[PDB]
From a paper:
Here, we report the rational design, X-ray crystal structure, and electron transfer activity of a multi-cofactor protein that incorporates essential elements of photosynthetic reaction centers. To this end, we have designed a photosynthetic reaction center protein maquette (the RC maquette) and solved its X-ray crystal structure in multiple states of assembly. The RC maquette uses histidine (His) residues in the hydrophobic core to coordinate the central metals of tetrapyrroles for site-specific cofactor binding.
In the nearby metal binding site, Glu/His ligation of Cd(II) in the RC maquette accurately reproduces the geometry of the binuclear Mn(II) cluster shown to be photochemically active in modified bacterioferritin. While the introduction of a hydrogen bond from Tyr to a His residue appears to have little impact on the lifetime or yield of charge separation by itself, the addition of Asp31 adjacent to the His71-Tyr168 hydrogen bond raises the yield from 2 ± 1% to 11.5 ± 0.7% and shortens the lifetime of charge separation from 40 ± 20 ms to 3 ± 1 ms at pH 9.5. Bacterioferritin-like ferroxidase activity demonstrates that the diiron site is redox active. Light-induced electron transfer is clear as near-stoichiometric Fe(II) prolongs the lifetime of charge separation from 2.0 ms to 250 ms at pH 7.5 in RC maquette variant L71H (orange and Supplementary Figs. 8b and 10a).
Residue numbers in the entry: 1 to 196
């Protein structure tokens, strides 16, 4: 009903804010792991003597350099998402305050902001998914080329990679929840002034 629907919309948007925060923090923990993983890869790579193991390591390392970069895009789409969320909150409150006395430019802004934030989430999701498939390949390669020697650190590189995958899977799950919240904010939002 109309007050209850207003509150649901409001509560979805609070839930969404908290989730965006969780996504950003997880993204920073992921970049910390990437940097620490690069150090461990270089350590394995220096000690490697077999040419093929050396090469496999250096090609993982290239991927990881790319993932550092892609973390810049992850971070930014998330940041921009939080910016648009701020603007959703602000335009939202102004809509309730002013109604249709706040002219049509206000209602269009809020709709347009909703449209754009869903695209940023899709962009963010696609970037995360691409990193994750890489890390799944890294594990296969590491399990394949490395042995039980001290210098290989099969355990240390694998452990780090495995912790990373667990976190990137979580990241994608939080993103899918976010996209689902946005859908529901649209579904409730469209109803809010239908018996206003
Ligand atoms: C992530 C946060 C939010 C999203 C994605 C979002 C999205 C939407 C969407 C898609 C609509 C339907 C727009 C249309 O009629 O074409 C809507 C309506 C509305 N939203 Fe939000 N909203 C959010 C947060 C808020 C907040 C915090 C308020 C605060 C009061 C608010 C107030 C409104 C109002 C009053 C309407 C009905 C009038 C209108 O259609 O413009 N919204 N919202």
């Amino acid at each position: 009903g109309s007050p209850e629907l207003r509150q649901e919309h409001q509560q979805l948007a609070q839930e969404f804010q908290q989730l965006l925060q969780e996504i950003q923090q997880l993204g920073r923990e992921l970049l910390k792991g990437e940097l620490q993983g690069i150090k461990q890869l270089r350590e394995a790579s220096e000690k490697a003597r077999n040419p093929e193991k050396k090469s496999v390591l250096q090609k993982i390392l290239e991927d990881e350099e790319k993932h550092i970069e892609l973390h810049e895009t992850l971070q930014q789409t998330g940041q921009e998402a939080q910016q648009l969320l701020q603007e959703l909150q602000q335009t939202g409150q102004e809509l309730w305050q002013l109604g249709g006395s706040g002219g049509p430019e206000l209602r269009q802004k809020h709709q347009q902001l909703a449209q754009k934030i869903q695209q940023l989430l899709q962009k963010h999701q696609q970037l995360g998914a691409k990193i994750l498939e890489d890390e799944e390949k890294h594990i296969e390669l590491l399990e394949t080329i490395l042995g039980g020697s001290g210098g290989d650190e099969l355990r240390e590189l694998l452990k780090g990679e495995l912790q990373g995958i667990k976190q990137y899977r979580e990241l994608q799950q939080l993103g899918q929840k976010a996209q689902q919240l946005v859908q529901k904010l649209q579904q409730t939002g469209q109803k809010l002034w239908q018996l206003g």
